[PDB]
Amino acid sequence: MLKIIIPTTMLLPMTWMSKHNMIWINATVHSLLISLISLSLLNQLGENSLNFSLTFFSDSLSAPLLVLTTWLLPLMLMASQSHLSKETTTRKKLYITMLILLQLFLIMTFTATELILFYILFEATLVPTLIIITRWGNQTERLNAGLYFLFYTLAGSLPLLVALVYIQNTTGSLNFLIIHYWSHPLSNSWSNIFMWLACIMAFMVKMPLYGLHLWLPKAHVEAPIAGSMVLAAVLLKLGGYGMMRITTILNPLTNYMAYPFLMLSMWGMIMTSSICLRQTDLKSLIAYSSVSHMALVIVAIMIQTPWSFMGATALMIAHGLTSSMLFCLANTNYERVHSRTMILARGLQTLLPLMATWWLVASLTNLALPPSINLIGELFIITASFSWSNITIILMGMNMMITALYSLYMLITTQRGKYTHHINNIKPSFTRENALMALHILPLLLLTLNPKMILGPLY
Amino acid sequence: TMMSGRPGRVPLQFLPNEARSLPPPKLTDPRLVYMGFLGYCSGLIDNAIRRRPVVSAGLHRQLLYVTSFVFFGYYLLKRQDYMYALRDHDMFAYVKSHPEDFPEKDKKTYGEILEEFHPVR
Amino acid sequence: MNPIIYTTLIMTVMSGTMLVMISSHWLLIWIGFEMNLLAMIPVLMKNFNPRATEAATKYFLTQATASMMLMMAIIINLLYSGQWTITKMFNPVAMTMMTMALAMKLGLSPFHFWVPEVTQGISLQAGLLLLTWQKLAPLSVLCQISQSINPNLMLTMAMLSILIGGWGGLNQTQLRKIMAYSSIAHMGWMTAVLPYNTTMTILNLLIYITMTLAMFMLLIHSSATTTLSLSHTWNKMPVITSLMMVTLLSMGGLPPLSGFMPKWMIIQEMTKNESIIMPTLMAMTALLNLYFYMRLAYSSSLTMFPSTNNMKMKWQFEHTKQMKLLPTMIVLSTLVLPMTPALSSLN
Amino acid sequence: LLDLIWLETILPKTTSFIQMKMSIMVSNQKGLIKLYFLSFLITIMISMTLFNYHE
Amino acid sequence: AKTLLHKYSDIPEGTECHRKAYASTSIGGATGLIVSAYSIALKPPASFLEGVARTGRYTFTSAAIGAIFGLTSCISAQVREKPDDPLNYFIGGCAGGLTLGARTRSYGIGAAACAYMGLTAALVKMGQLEGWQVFAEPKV
Amino acid sequence: PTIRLQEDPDPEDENLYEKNPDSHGYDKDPIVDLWNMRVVFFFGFSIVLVLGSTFVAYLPDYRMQEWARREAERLVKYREANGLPLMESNCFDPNKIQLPEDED
Amino acid sequence: PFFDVQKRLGLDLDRWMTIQSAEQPHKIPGRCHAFEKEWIECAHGIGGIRAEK
Amino acid sequence: NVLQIVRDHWVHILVPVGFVFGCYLDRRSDEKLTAFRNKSLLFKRELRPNEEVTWK
Amino acid sequence: IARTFYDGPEKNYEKTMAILQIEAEKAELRLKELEVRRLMRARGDGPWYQYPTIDKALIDHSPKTTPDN
Ligand SMILES: CCCCCCCCCCCCCCCCCC(=O)OC[C@H](COP(=O)([O-])OCC(O)COP(=O)([O-])OC[C@@H](COC(=O)CCCCCCCCCCCCCCCCC)OC(=O)CCCCCCCCCCCCCCCCC)OC(=O)CCCCCCCCCCCCCCCCC
Ligand SMILES: CCCCCCCCCCCCCCCCCC(=O)OC[C@H](COP(=O)([O-])OCC(O)COP(=O)([O-])OC[C@@H](COC(=O)CCCCCCCCCCCCCCCCC)OC(=O)CCCCCCCCCCCCCCCCC)OC(=O)CCCCCCCCCCCCCCCCC
Ligand SMILES: CCCCCCCCCCCCCCCCCC(=O)OC[C@H](COP(=O)([O-])OCC(O)COP(=O)([O-])OC[C@@H](COC(=O)CCCCCCCCCCCCCCCCC)OC(=O)CCCCCCCCCCCCCCCCC)OC(=O)CCCCCCCCCCCCCCCCC
Ligand SMILES: CCCCCCCCCCCCCCCCC[C@@H](O)O[C@H](CO[C@H](O)CCCCCCCCCCCCCCC)COP(=O)(O)OCC[N+](C)(C)C
Ligand SMILES: CCCCCCCC/C=C\CCCCCCCC(=O)O[C@H](COC(=O)CCCCCCC/C=C/CCCCCCCC)COP(=O)(O)OCCN
Numbered sequence A: 001m002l003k004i005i006i007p008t009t010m011l012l013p014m015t016w017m018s019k020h021n022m023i024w025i026n027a028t029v030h031s032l033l034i035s036l037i038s039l040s041l042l043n044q045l046g047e048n049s050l051n052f053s054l055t056f057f058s059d060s061l062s063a064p065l066l067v068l069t070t071w072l073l074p075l076m077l078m079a080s081q082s083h084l085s086k087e088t089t090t091r092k093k094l095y096i097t098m099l100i101l102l103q104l105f106l107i108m109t110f111t112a113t114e115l116i117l118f119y120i121l122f123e124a125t126l127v128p129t130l131i132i133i134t135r136w137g138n139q140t141e142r143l144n145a146g147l148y149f150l151f152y153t154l155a156g157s158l159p160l161l162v163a164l165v166y167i168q169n170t171t172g173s174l175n176f177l178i179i180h181y182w183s184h185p186l187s188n189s190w191s192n193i194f195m196w197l198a199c200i201m202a203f204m205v206k207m208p209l210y211g212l213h214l215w216l217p218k219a220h221v222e223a224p225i226a227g228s229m230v231l232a233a234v235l236l237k238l239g240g241y242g243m244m245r246i247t248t249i250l251n252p253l254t255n256y257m258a259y260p261f262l263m264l265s266m267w268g269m270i271m272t273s274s275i276c277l278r279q280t281d282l283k284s285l286i287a288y289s290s291v292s293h294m295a296l297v298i299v300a301i302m303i304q305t306p307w308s309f310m311g312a313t314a315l316m317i318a319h320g321l322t323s324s325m326l327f328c329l330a331n332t333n334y335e336r337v338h339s340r341t342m343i344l345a346r347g348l349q350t351l352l353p354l355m356a357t358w359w360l361v362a363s364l365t366n367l368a369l370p371p372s373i374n375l376i377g378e379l380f381i382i383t384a385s386f387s388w389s390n391i392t393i394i395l396m397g398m399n400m401m402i403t404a405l406y407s408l409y410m411l412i413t414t415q416r417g418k419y420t421h422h423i424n425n426i427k428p429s430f431t432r433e434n435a436l437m438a439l440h441i442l443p444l445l446l447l448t449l450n451p452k453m454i455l456g457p458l459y
Numbered sequence B: 001t002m003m004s005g006r007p008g009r010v011p012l013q014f015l016p017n018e019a020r021s022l023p024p025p026k027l028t029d030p031r032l033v034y035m036g037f038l039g040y041c042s043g044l045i046d047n048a049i050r051r052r053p054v055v056s057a058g059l060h061r062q063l064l065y066v067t068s069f070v071f072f073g074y075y076l077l078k079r080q081d082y083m084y085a086l087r088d089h090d091m092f093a094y095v096k097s098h099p100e101d102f103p104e105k106d107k108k109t110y111g112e113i114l115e116e117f118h119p120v121r
Numbered sequence C: 001m002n003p004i005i006y007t008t009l010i011m012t013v014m015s016g017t018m019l020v021m022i023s024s025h026w027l028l029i030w031i032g033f034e035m036n037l038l039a040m041i042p043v044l045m046k047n048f049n050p051r052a053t054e055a056a057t058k059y060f061l062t063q064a065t066a067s068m069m070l071m072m073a074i075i076i077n078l079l080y081s082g083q084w085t086i087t088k089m090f091n092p093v094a095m096t097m098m099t100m101a102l103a104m105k106l107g108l109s110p111f112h113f114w115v116p117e118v119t120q121g122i123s124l125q126a127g128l129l130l131l132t133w134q135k136l137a138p139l140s141v142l143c144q145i146s147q148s149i150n151p152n153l154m155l156t157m158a159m160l161s162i163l164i165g166g167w168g169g170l171n172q173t174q175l176r177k178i179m180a181y182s183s184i185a186h187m188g189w190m191t192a193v194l195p196y197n198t199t200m201t202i203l204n205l206l207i208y209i210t211m212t213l214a215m216f217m218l219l220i221h222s223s224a225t226t227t228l229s230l231s232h233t234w235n236k237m238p239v240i241t242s243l244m245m246v247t248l249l250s251m252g253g254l255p256p257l258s259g260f261m262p263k264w265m266i267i268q269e270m271t272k273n274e275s276i277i278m279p280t281l282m283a284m285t286a287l288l289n290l291y292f293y294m295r296l297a298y299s300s301s302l303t304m305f306p307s308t309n310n311m312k313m314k315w316q317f318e319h320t321k322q323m324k325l326l327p328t329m330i331v332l333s334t335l336v337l338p339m340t341p342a343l344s345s346l347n
Numbered sequence D: 001l002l003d004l005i006w007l008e009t010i011l012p013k014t015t016s017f018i019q020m021k022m023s024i025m026v027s028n029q030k031g032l033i034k035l036y037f038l039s040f041l042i043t044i045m046i047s048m049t050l051f052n053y054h055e
Numbered sequence E: 001a002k003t004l005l006h007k008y009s010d011i012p013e014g015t016e017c018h019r020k021a022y023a024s025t026s027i028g029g030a031t032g033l034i035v036s037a038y039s040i041a042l043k044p045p046a047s048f049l050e051g052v053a054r055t056g057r058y059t060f061t062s063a064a065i066g067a068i069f070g071l072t073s074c075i076s077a078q079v080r081e082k083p084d085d086p087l088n089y090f091i092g093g094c095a096g097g098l099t100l101g102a103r104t105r106s107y108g109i110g111a112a113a114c115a116y117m118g119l120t121a122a123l124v125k126m127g128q129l130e131g132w133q134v135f136a137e138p139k140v
Numbered sequence F: 001p002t003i004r005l006q007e008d009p010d011p012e013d014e015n016l017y018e019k020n021p022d023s024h025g026y027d028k029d030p031i032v033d034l035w036n037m038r039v040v041f042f043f044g045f046s047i048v049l050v051l052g053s054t055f056v057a058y059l060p061d062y063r064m065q066e067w068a069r070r071e072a073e074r075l076v077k078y079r080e081a082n083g084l085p086l087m088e089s090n091c092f093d094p095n096k097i098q099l100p101e102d103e104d
Numbered sequence G: 001p002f003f004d005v006q007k008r009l010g011l012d013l014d015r016w017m018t019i020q021s022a023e024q025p026h027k028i029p030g031r032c033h034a035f036e037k038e039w040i041e042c043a044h045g046i047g048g049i050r051a052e053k
Numbered sequence H: 001n002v003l004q005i006v007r008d009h010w011v012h013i014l015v016p017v018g019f020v021f022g023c024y025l026d027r028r029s030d031e032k033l034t035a036f037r038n039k040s041l042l043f044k045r046e047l048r049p050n051e052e053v054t055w056k
Numbered sequence I: 001i002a003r004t005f006y007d008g009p010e011k012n013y014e015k016t017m018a019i020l021q022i023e024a025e026k027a028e029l030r031l032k033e034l035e036v037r038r039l040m041r042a043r044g045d046g047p048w049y050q051y052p053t054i055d056k057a058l059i060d061h062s063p064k065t066t067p068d069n
Helices: A002-016 A023-042 A064-082 A090-111 A115-124 A128-136 A144-173 A176-180 A190-206 A215-221 A226-237 A237-250 A252-259 A259-278 A283-302 A306-337 A355-367 A374-388 A393-413 A431-449 B016-021 B030-049 B059-097 C003-021 C026-044 C050-080 C092-106 C114-121 C124-144 C151-169 C175-194 C200-223 C238-252 C261-269 C277-302 C326-336 C338-344 D003-026 D033-048 E002-009 E017-041 E050-079 E085-105 E109-131 F029-056 F065-084 G007-008 G033-043 H002-033 I009-043
Strands: none
Touching: A002 A023, A002 A090, A002 D003, A002 H002, A023 A064, A023 A090, A023 F029, A023 H002, A064 A090, A064 A226, A064 A237, A064 A306, A090 A115, A090 A128, A090 A226, A115 A128, A115 A144, A115 A237, A128 A144, A128 C277, A144 A215, A144 A259, A144 C261, A176 A237, A176 I009, A190 A237, A190 A252, A190 E109, A215 A226, A215 A283, A215 C124, A226 A283, A226 A306, A237 A306, A237 C238, A252 A259, A259 A283, A259 A393, A259 C092, A283 A374, A283 A393, A283 C175, A283 H002, A306 A355, A306 A374, A306 A431, A306 F029, A355 A374, A355 A431, A374 A393, B016 B059, B016 C003, B030 B059, B030 C238, B030 C326, B059 C338, B059 E002, B059 I009, C003 C026, C003 C124, C003 C200, C026 C124, C050 C092, C050 C114, C050 C277, C050 D033, C092 C124, C092 C151, C092 C175, C092 D033, C114 C124, C114 C175, C114 H002, C124 C175, C124 C200, C151 C175, C151 C277, C151 D003, C151 D033, C151 I009, C175 C200, C175 C277, C175 E002, C200 C238, C200 C261, C200 C326, C200 C338, C238 C277, C238 C326, C261 C277, C261 C338, D033 E017, E002 E017, E017 E050, E050 E085, E050 E109, E085 E109
């Protein structure tokens, strides 16, 4: 599948060899072309994955994520070319280089057939995101945000490397096909328990889990718009993809060992949904909504049934798109008002009607409105959990209620009421922002037209 | 260090005559291409440090960088391949020389191997 | 100091370490160590000042004590077998003497105290020489007698070195002390895998030397020895700051950067033979080294510290003496991870 | 009570506090050769009567 | 030296609580003596009497930790009739941590010492059970 | 100086609509801004979106589901006509499975 | 580490003094010449690992 | 006027030629995995009277 | 679309068959190498892990100014 990797490594020097006022046009055009090309991996065999070579293969789980990343890059470029207008040419090229490198590492991550190569790229995605957050942020807390983002990930993912090298020393290989065909049960011993923990906690903190989620609000608030988009859309799904890949080796230990993680995920989903209600900031609310949705995905992966896996894949894609759109919508208001407080700018529907419509659509898709793919994933996960235990429906229904509550609360506070009477610099919406919103939202509806493309390999 | 001391090993050869029985790496080898790319990156960094036009300051210097990196990489790859071939040869000779330590075990089919089933529920 | 005298002293230092590395007699190894110390003492004192004098004094005292212990080890080993060849060294007490003497010469913990002080007391050139070249001979002797060496003693000092290097580096603001503590932490990693596989030791040595050379050469380019003095070079040479930030990330152990290769290979080699706890502890401790590298990077390039008015005059002048091997060292310090399998050419 | 106080206290703030304390404890040496040469002597006595005594 | 660890280990885990407590407190006293020696060497006490006071303080604290750990672990393993269980070592470790907190008179230090010493003692017990190695001999 | 820095004053926001009533919000130079809008629209809405959706809608049935339906139809027809059970509980032939000899 | 240039060039810089039964001046023998010679002959061939068993 | 337009838009071919090179490299990668071509128990089949390979 | 952009399923089938064979061979070779290394380091009779001894060519077989030795 080098026909997708090589064009990105050509996006790099093309960006570096462009004219001072033509970098954005070229980058956007060629990234959109690359996403169109990557749209060709959606043709998946029902039997087994597509194995292009010894190193790279594509599965029904990998293809939606690859398409999402390749589609994400142009939107990030469109959103970044507003606050970077005063930057010099070299720093603009460096920013685009960081974005392109992040896309390249993400593309190579979702298709690597060997677990150590997957780990290497999964961790190589840390350098560009960190540079972006700590170099092109806005407040003085971006340094602490970057430190938290780096160390929460690394302190949980270093044991994964030891676990993987030990696995290769014992079984003899780390290729995913060989791992899946030659898989054997894990006995009940302390050594195997710590093997479980080492294999799981890295992806758990990448989700993040409820107890290990402290880095996410800092990173998503203090990052620039492109950093927030890429963090909330694809960089969170690395943990889910990792657990869905690594869980095959773990059984039968996982049934016994998933009780604390399931409990944390459910209760913390409730807790973060409740936290979203009493939030004075606008980006923190979206960050905590991401935490709640990813906790639901964690439950789906942990109970480990085919319906749960399909729901997890659908929810991952839908949440990526919705969270990216919400972050862009918040960023437009932040650029108008130059503050992140929610109640500062009120009654924006009378001043920006089309943005009011975009806000309404994003909030509707955030609270799982039928028949959007958000609801498809959420409902499949809820059904799988109900089969797992009939009492989980209480927690799921409470989460749904609180999600609707805080989504409509944000929509009403930001859009309805009367204007603030003293903000007279709210200019009419540009064409760029409306185009970005439309390019975020139309794929969601087009996908709910044909939902079998994002239901994963268990379909 | 397992291979530091070996029978019939000239100390500072870096390429024993026994290594000429192996196929030399092709000149279009991807590792050689990466070595040339490393040379090009070093040349660009050299141009940047001296405050010169990065892309086109010195063409002869960049050419020398690339060719030096490729020249060293060829022999580095030759030695690496020789050492891996030597390792495999010694491994096979040892496993053949000691058959009792590497016995051929029975080949059961899954129809008679009993594996315990773990239901997911 | 006259240039001929300086170059002949440097050649005498290199001759001493080569005599250590090419000799099979224990006496010739001891002679090489003595020659190295004798010609190394004046190099530290090339720029005369009281700090350089006391740094040289501390270095001389430590090295003389280590040489005394080393020769006592040699004499005891001779006593219990009339052999001079550098070999197994079966005798346990003599082997303990040799291991401790070589640890004192290397700077391994708990003998690590001298390294930060001597590094701070000497110039950047002498610090570069001390931190890179002065590790070859003790490491060569350790590699030769590695089978004989006791694992418990070696492992305990390596872990202590990693821990103390990280904790000490967490505090310092001076760049030379940071480099010294990083050197101690890296010595811990290299001596950790020594009983299991010396090829990994040699590979880690090569990469550490490359990274330290690049870092010192960049520090010499932007003549700063403190954090605040390094915080100005973004206003004069931004490319130097960017390269330094990338090199500092590489030193941290992050992937896809090259620095990660020695750490990954050492963990993999130690795992092959049922050592699981130790690699986990070493990685979680190297997180501290990464932290203070990252703090330096925040101070250096990822932010913009306030500058001074006189920098406008420096804007008009170019760096006269240019280091020829800096770009190659930077490239080998960062972009050489994909060529990992070439480590087989080291055994 | 949970996010801004206790979840911060347990994992990140405890780690920062412990590493700060250990960095301070390690990195306060007056620079007098007498003290750490005495420490070298203690290390020598320990090593010889804790490692090689059992073989 | 390691003979002290032999003294502690040669005793069956859920028997002879007094002897096991004596072995553990001897190990603790040795560790405290070593720590005090290093502390005096690196941070001089400015007088002989204060140095003796610091040595006694460190040694007594460490011996108390060892005695409490050994006694509590042995008693908990004996009353529960279930040896080879890391919970006993966890309880002993938390008892030692509470002893440390009482000695230094710090509630937070006491709680942290409970948690961390209990965890590390539990992992030591699991390593004893499964045969983990810290300083593994080279096997390859 | 009762201050601490020789610092530039904080610049005020630059409105793109002041010097360009029809801005599109991409750039300051009108021509490159208009062309950036045009390429974004043509390659996002025209090329990638519509053509990509109509390409995905017409992907060949490589998932083997119409094939699976035809297989099921023929097998149901054959099995029901013969009087055989519609589905068999044992996925594999018991003759080819060698269970352990005894359980005592 | 051990760059054996004596073996490559055939120089014998310091190998004449390593052992006790190697060409002493005036053919004066060491006190344990026979024992060391016996150990060396048996020892040289197999390698270090087999030489201790 | 080919001069200015070419010297300003020569960068608009890097991505297409990269795509073509990627396709060519994928074909070469396929060419080294032909160890079981027309040898799988499921798709084993006699050749046509004119063809020589089942797939490339 | 299937004629222009894709190939038949047999190509993917046989490609993954070859890939599986290669990976299985590599796994078996890695395990065999680990076992061989363990045995050769334990025993010391293998070509690998040979530790240098004293050359017998250094001994002087000449009359030694005293009859016995
Ligand atoms: C995996 C796939 C491949 C990826 C590998 C990695 C990337 C490639 C290898 C990297 C090494 C190569 C280049 C590095 C040295 C370049 C030095 C430099 O600064 O560049 C400036 C230079 C612009 O300078 P200028 O044009 O002379 O005039 C403006 C002045 O220089 C005015 O300059 P100024 O000094 O006034 O500007 C100030 C600026 C100056 O500071 C800088 O510009 C930063 C320099 C970059 C750091 C070098 C790191 C060393 C390599 C390690 C890479 C790590 C990779 C791992 C991933 C993690 C990334 C950190 O400082 C700042 O703005 C401070 C902001 C702080 C940001 C922190 C980020 C720094 C680290 C970023 C590293 C990213 C990777 C390198 C990507 C390429 C960057 C050039 O850029 C270039 O024009 C050359 C770039 C490369 C040209 C490629 C062309 C290839 C051939 C063309 C045709 C293509 C094929 C045709 C055939 C088609 C068939 C028919
Ligand atoms: C093959 C390799 C092996 C190599 C080793 C071979 C060794 C064997 C042969 C050695 C023969 C000795 C020949 C000449 C030696 C040269 C001495 C010298 O030059 O003195 C310079 C040195 C500096 O003199 P200065 O600075 O000019 O004058 C300072 C003023 O006089 C007064 O200054 P200040 O009052 O202003 O300052 C307060 C005072 C501070 O003094 C204190 O605070 C004393 C505190 C000690 C704690 C007392 C024990 C309480 C509990 C004991 C528990 C026992 C176990 C029972 C179970 C538990 C019950 C609780 O002084 C200090 O700050 C310095 C502390 C040094 C204390 C003694 C150093 C011994 C080693 C370091 C460890 C310290 C002991 C800690 C506890 C260890 C376990 C007992 O003099 C001293 O440090 C003090 C006098 C030393 C005289 C005795 C030296 C002989 C012992 C050498 C150690 C070797 C071990 C002995 C045999 C071990 C068995 C194998
Ligand atoms: C993962 C998801 C999210 C997780 C995150 C959220 C959860 C985790 C974080 C929250 C938990 C952390 C709290 C742990 C200790 C932190 C306290 C601290 O910072 O110390 C420094 C802090 C201040 O430092 P300082 O400067 O040295 O002292 C100045 C004070 O202001 C001067 O104060 P004062 O002198 O004026 O008066 C204080 C004094 C006087 O006392 C008082 O003033 C009030 C009384 C408070 C403590 C007395 C105990 C009676 C209350 C306990 C009731 C049962 C608890 C719940 C169980 C329900 C059973 C169904 O207190 C005492 O003397 C008590 C000494 C020891 C008694 C503690 C034993 C009870 C433990 C509970 C056992 C439960 C077993 C499991 C059952 C559940 C499963 C079925 O010390 C304190 O002031 C508070 C210490 C007492 C609080 C005890 C609370 C413990 C709660 C349970 C612990 C189990 C969780 C941890 C597992 C591992 C531990 C074994
Ligand atoms: C903020 C959130 C961060 C992430 C949280 C991750 C949670 C990880 C916790 C791991 C869950 C279970 C671990 C071990 C499995 C069983 C635990 C125990 O309750 O089971 C009993 C075990 O008895 C004792 O309880 C043993 C455990 C006691 C010592 C462990 C310390 C637990 C105290 C809490 C420490 C804090 C953990 C989190 C650190 C931050 C049953 O006895 P038995 O069936 O015979 O033995 C089971 C194990 N066998 C089968 C392999 C032999
Ligand atoms: C954001 C911060 C998150 C921090 C998460 C960190 C915790 C990760 C879980 C433990 C990681 C280390 C486990 C080791 C990796 C696998 C190695 C393995 O499987 O081998 C085991 C070895 O297992 C171990 O050695 C485990 C020792 C653990 C030492 C370090 C403990 C770290 C902290 C423990 C508690 C953490 C777990 C829960 C933490 C939750 C998050 C707070 C079996 O040994 P064998 O050689 O095969 O011999 C058996 C046959 N005779």
